Amino acid sequence: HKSEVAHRFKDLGEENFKALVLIAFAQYLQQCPFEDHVKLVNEVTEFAKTCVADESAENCDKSLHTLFGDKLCTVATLRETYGEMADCCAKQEPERNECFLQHKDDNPNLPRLVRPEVDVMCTAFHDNEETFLKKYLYEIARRHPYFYAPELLFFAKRYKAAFTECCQAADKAACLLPKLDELRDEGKASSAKQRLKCASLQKFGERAFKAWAVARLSQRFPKAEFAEVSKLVTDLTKVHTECCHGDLLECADDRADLAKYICENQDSISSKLKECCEKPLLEKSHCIAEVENDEMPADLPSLAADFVESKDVCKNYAEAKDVFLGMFLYEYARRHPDYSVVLLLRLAKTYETTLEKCCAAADPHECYAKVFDEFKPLVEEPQNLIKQNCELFEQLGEYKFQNALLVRYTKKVPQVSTPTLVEVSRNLGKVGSKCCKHPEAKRMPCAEDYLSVVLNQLCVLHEKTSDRVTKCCTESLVNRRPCFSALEVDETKEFNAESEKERQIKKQTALVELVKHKPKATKEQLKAVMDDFAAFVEKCCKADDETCFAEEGKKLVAASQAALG
Amino acid sequence: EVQLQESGGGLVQPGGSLRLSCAASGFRFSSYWMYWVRQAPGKGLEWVSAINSSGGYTRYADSVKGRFTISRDNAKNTLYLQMNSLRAEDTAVYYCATDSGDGKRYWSGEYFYRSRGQGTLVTVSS
């Protein structure tokens, strides 16, 4: 309304406002010092407050884009430091904002962040809490200029939570370090998802994006009408389209809007939104997005009678098109939370192909009469990979599963860097631990999640790059995972002679290097050296001497060279 | 059993007004999207407009945009359609429809529906 800054200050609260303002500026003006950003934020904050006090006061009626750009253009160094960004200041809105978006440099090429010693950190923390956090918030933001600021701020609050707890402890390190890793991990993942989703929307187009979204929202809100699910799909697609284009202010208004709508109609979407919708506004969009699947309504009628049996299937296909198809996906999805989204899409694609062929035929009804049987193999295929790998993980346990996987994939693609190999396989085994703990019903959605993050990591690794995996990485996200599972051994390295998990990683690095130089040797032979190696190290760590490691290792090398060839 | 009953139809001059009402029962009206469809003499069914479960989310066919205002009163299970700036070509039978389910589906040209009423005749001429 009037004083919308006033509206956003009052909605966010002063502290969250200040944090977000900082992040926003940090992201555009990446090469400005900390002390300057703080002053910019304090200027904005003090102004904000005047508008709250009186909505009628000078400039309070401006939009947030005007006030934002105005503030950027006050900057003294703006031409010296950022060059053309200064030319944006000559333009009126909304061209000005646009012009500023262009000049956000994704890779600031600034020094990579050194984690200090936990002592020094916790002191910095205790000396000035605010400065310490803000500083880190600043440093992260200016390196990730495309990170939804509210999301950044959420991590920031868990950083603070970590410090407040782990620092008052006998081992700051025992408590603080895992959390810091976990957070940095989660954030890097979060980014990866966002980036993927945008690449896909651009690459595969809006339609594909909407298909995917219909599937996911139908599972999530199965008590919602087809017409409501379609509404939500539309709005979500616009928010994603907006957000990808990189404007924080529009992105956030559209997320706020979508959240607000969903909460106004909760009763018609999900029982599960009750608490989400009492959450403070920065929290609510984020909370809704991670809400659990609702119960699917009891005794829903058969999918087949509307699509397999009822007349007008080709009339409605031909009249409604994507809506008819959209409805199929919706109706299949809401009845099948046990499925991964990519599966539901494969099914949908199959039905749609069936209809293209059949509705072109003399007797369509005959030709599509038994389409549902075409689903049976598509559904069984992932179901069985789950069962089979889950049992092997249950038999073997995380560590040695990772090594079972380590062999499998070095054999299938030995060209790839073993580090990448060690890390992919290690992750996959963690995926296994994550997923097989769930009820079989909840495994396949769980897998699809944790695989997509792993498979993507691998795929973005292949930028500085093995020819075969590019096909899989440049497929539709639907058929990525099956294209990968379709790998077989390459079939077509010299011998160099040259601590908990880190020791394990070294052992694995060795295992891959063994399988490299020697791809051919069987699995009994791998088992042998693995055991003789387990025996060598236990022997020499136990021995009082370094000499034992030296003499045994030549013996172990020689012993296994013989047992090779 | 879904039950709809339209009313308020009748004859008006070009550029006149009407207010169609529709009485719902047999389903939880307040939790479902409601539509207005129409069929001109000799023509196919047209989608006219749509409203969400709560209200405050309305859509309109291009032709009627700016002219007709759909709304609902959930307290009364009544769907309204306020027809202003009427035209000769707006002469048709106006049904109200819903997708309350477990039933056969039909295409209105923007939304599938499941049940519609008897209709109300609107004539616009002279």
Domain ranges within chain B, ordered by starting residue:
3-124
* Chain B hits for A327, Cβ within 8 Å: 112
Q: Which amino acid is at A349?
A: K
What stretch of H or E contains A390?
Answer: helix A375-396
Pairing of strands B45-51, B34-39: antiparallel
Q: Which residues lie closer than 8 Å to A255 by C-beta, 6 or more apart?
A: A239, A243, A285
Q: What is the CA radius of gyration of chain A?
A: 28
Beta carbons within 8 Å of A62's beta carbon, 6+ residues apart: A5, A70
Q: Cα–Cα distance between A497 and A553 in angstroms, integer? A: 10
Q: Do B99 and A225 touch (CB under 8 A)?
A: yes
Distance CA A290, CA A403 (A): 33
A110 touches chain B (CB under 8 A): no
Q: What letters, b where the CB count within 10 A reaches 16 and e where it falls short, cover B18-35?
A: bebbbbbeebebbbbbbb
The verdict on B44 touching A (C-beta cutoff 8 Å) is no
Length of chain B: 126
Report the distance separating Cα A404 and Cα A388, nearest Å: 13
Chain B within 8 Å of A235 (Cβ-Cβ)? Answer: no
Cα separation of A212 and A426, whole Å?
A: 29
Question: Would you call A107 exposed, middle or buried from its count of C-beta atoms within 10 A (0-12, 13-18, 19+)?
Answer: exposed
Q: Which amino acid is at A190?
A: S
User: Cβ of B58 under 8 Å from any chain A Cβ?
Assistant: no
In 3D space, the residue among A71, A89, A69, A70 whose CA is nearest the CA of residue A79 turns out to be: A89
Separation CA B29–CA B33 (nearest Å): 8
Q: State how far residue B26 is from chain A, nearest Cα, in angstroms.
A: 17
Tell me how far apart the alpha carbons of residues B101 and B113 are, in angstroms, rounded to a whole number. Answer: 9
* Resolution as reported, in Å: 3.1
Closest-CA residue of B relative to A299 is B102
Instruction: Mark yes or no for CB contact A301/B102 under 8 Å.
Output: yes
Instruction: Return d(Cα A512, Cα A406) in angstroms, integer.
Output: 7
Furthest-apart CA atoms within chain B: distance in Å = 44
Q: Flag whether residue B33 sits within 8 Å of chain A, measured between CB atoms.
A: yes
Distance CA B19, CA A448 (A): 52
Please report where in the chains the tokens 């129409």 appear, as a residue: B38
A87 CB-side CA count, 13 A: 7
User: What domains sit in chain A, N to C, each tagged with a CATH number?
Assistant: 4-102 (1.10.246.10), 118-185 (1.10.246.10), 223-288 (1.10.246.10), 303-380 (1.10.246.10), 383-485 (1.10.246.10), 501-562 (1.10.246.10)
- AA letter at A149: A
Structure-determination approach: X-ray
Tokens at A224, concatenated: 């919602």
Q: What is the CB neighbour count within 10 angstroms for residue A114?
A: 5
**Fold of the B3-124 domain:** Immunoglobulin-like (2.60.40)
Residues at the binding site of A are 1, 4, 11, 65, 238, 242, 245, 247, 250, 253, 257
Chain position carrying tokens 């389409």: A371
A249: CB partners within 8 A, 6+ apart: A64, A65, A68
Kindly state whether B57 is in contact with chain A, defined as any CB-CB distance less than 8 angstroms: yes
In angstroms, the separation between the Cα of residue A254 and the nearest Cα of chain B is 16
Q: Most A CBs within 10 Å: which of B2, B31, B46, as the mutation test of the A interface?
A: B31
By the 8 A CB rule, do B60 and B68 touch? yes
Ramachandran angles phi, psi of B36, nearest 5°: -115, 125
Tell me the C-alpha distance between B6 and B3, whole Å: 10
Q: Which of B123, B100, B126, B120 is nearest to B112 (CA)?
A: B100
Determine whether the interchain pair B112/A310 forms a contact, defined as Cβ–Cβ distance below 8 Å. Answer: no
Side chain identity, residue A70: D
Determine if residue A118 is left, alpha or beta; phi over 0 gives left, psi from -120 to 50 gives alpha, anything else beta. alpha
A269 DSSP 8-state letter:
T
**Rounded to an integer, what distance in angstroms lies between the CA atom of residue A294 and that of residue A297?**
9
Contact A228/B99, CB-based, under 8 Å? no
- Strand (E) or helix (H) holding A139: helix A129-141
Per the CB < 8 A criterion, the answer to whether B9 and B17 are in contact is: no
b (16+ CB within 10 A) / e for B67-85:
bbebebeeeebbbbbebee
Task: Say if CB A378 and CB A345 are below 8 A apart.
Answer: no
Contact present, A27 and A149 (Cβ < 8 Å): yes
Interchain CB distance below 8 Å, A264 and B53: no
Distance CA(A43)–CA(A34), nearest Å, equals 15
Residues 6+ apart with CB under 8 A from A85: A78, A79, A100, A103
Chain B partners within 8 Å of A306 (Cβ)? 105
